[PDB]
Design a protein around this ligand. Structure first.
Ligand SMILES: Nc1nc2c(ncn2[C@@H]2O[C@H](COP(=O)(O)OP(=O)(O)O)[C@@H](O)[C@H]2O)c(=O)[nH]1
Ligand SMILES: [Ca+2]
Length: 305
């Protein structure tokens, strides 16, 4: 399964650059923007400049109608860069001109191309004002109509996890975790054949045409490791959609040879209970004898809609 991450606009491109800097095994990156100068500085292997005639290589100037029209006019170039992808993650900040209008077009194209299409977008800081928030809200809704599943990160949530001195770029890389570990988690499922196996068909079942989603990874060791890791997988402060109300869950537990059936059940009960719903669970287990006391809980939750 070929997995592609697409950054759309300023924020999405920066996301792509940070994930490449961090290091991502087995993923193709595509940078899409109206802003030529920013695209030139992208570390992405594939780069698409949209709306050249519209913007003369500049950004969209906070007009999302320009972002949309730019994307529509580069439809073929977008289709070519996508083609062959089984799963596409479209990442973008909502509120500007490019991301807000272009992202939902790129997602729609991706789904049309047959890819399972996941959106990971931000909402602007409240300090950015009501217009930008309202513009972003319209983008989020268009994005929701366009993707199989949508993860939304309010930038205001970043203020909940910094101290007064945390560098902004540091905050930004934390928001990146959501996407990064979701991709790496899915990538790892697909790659390894587990003792109780989950594959891309199961990802497709859990995420297809679903609306809101949560994706998390939790890692822990020691006495209550299974429970701690399950808790961490479902507990992000950055998320608009929490685990509450989930009806479908894909949960994988990775551990060493010491992984007990009892603790697998504990982990699952943490998830089931936090959803506060009868969850349709698709359960997986991987024994990695490279690991020792570490266990890894991977969660993809949907069915909120
Ligand atoms: N978390 C995060 N948010 C960003 C970043 N860059 C931009 N944003 C947010 O995304 C919104 C749109 O900005 P941007 O993507 O640069 O505009 P566009 O290129 O015209 O689509 C901004 O109002 C910010 O709230 C980033 O690197 N990280
Ligand atoms: Ca597998």
């Amino acid at each position: 399964a070929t997995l592609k991450v697409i950054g759309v606009g300023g924020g999405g491109n920066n996301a792509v650059n940070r994930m490449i800097d961090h290091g991502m095994n087995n993923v193709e990156f595509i940078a899409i923007n109206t802003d030529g100068q920013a695209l030139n500085l992208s570390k992405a292997e594939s780069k698409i400049q949209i709306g050249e005639k519209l913007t003369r290589g500049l950004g969209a100037g906070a007009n999302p109608e320009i972002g949309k029209k730019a994307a529509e006019e580069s439809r073929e170039q977008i289709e070519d860069a996508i083609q062959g992808a089984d799963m596409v993650f479209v990442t973008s900040g909502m509120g500007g001109g490019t991301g807000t209008g272009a992202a939902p077009v790129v997602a729609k194209i991706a789904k049309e191309m047959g890819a399972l299409t996941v959106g990971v977008v931000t909402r602007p800081f409240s300090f950015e004002g009501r217009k930008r928030q309202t513009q972003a809200a319209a983008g989020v809704e268009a994005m929701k109509a366009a993707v199989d599943t949508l993860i939304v990160i309010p930038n205001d949530r970043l203020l909940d996890i910094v101290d007064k001195s945390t560098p902004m770029m540091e905050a930004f890389k934390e928001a990146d975790n959501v996407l990064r570990q979701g991709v790496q988690g899915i990538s790892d499922l697909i790659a390894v054949s587990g003792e109780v196996n989950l594959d891309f068909a199961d990802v497709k079942t859990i995420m297809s045409n679903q609306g809101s989603a949560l994706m998390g990874i939790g890692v822990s060791s020691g006495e209550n490791r299974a429970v701690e890791a399950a808790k961490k997988a479902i507990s992000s402060p950055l998320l608009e959609t929490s685990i509450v109300g989930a009806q479908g869950v894909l949960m994988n537990i990775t551990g060493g040879e010491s992984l007990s059936l009892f603790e697998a059940q504990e982990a699952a009960d943490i998830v089931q209970d936090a959803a506060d719903e009868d969850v349709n669970m698709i359960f997986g287990t991987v024994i990695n004898p490279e690991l020792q006391d570490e266990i890894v809980v991977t969660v993809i939750a949907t069915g909120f809609d």
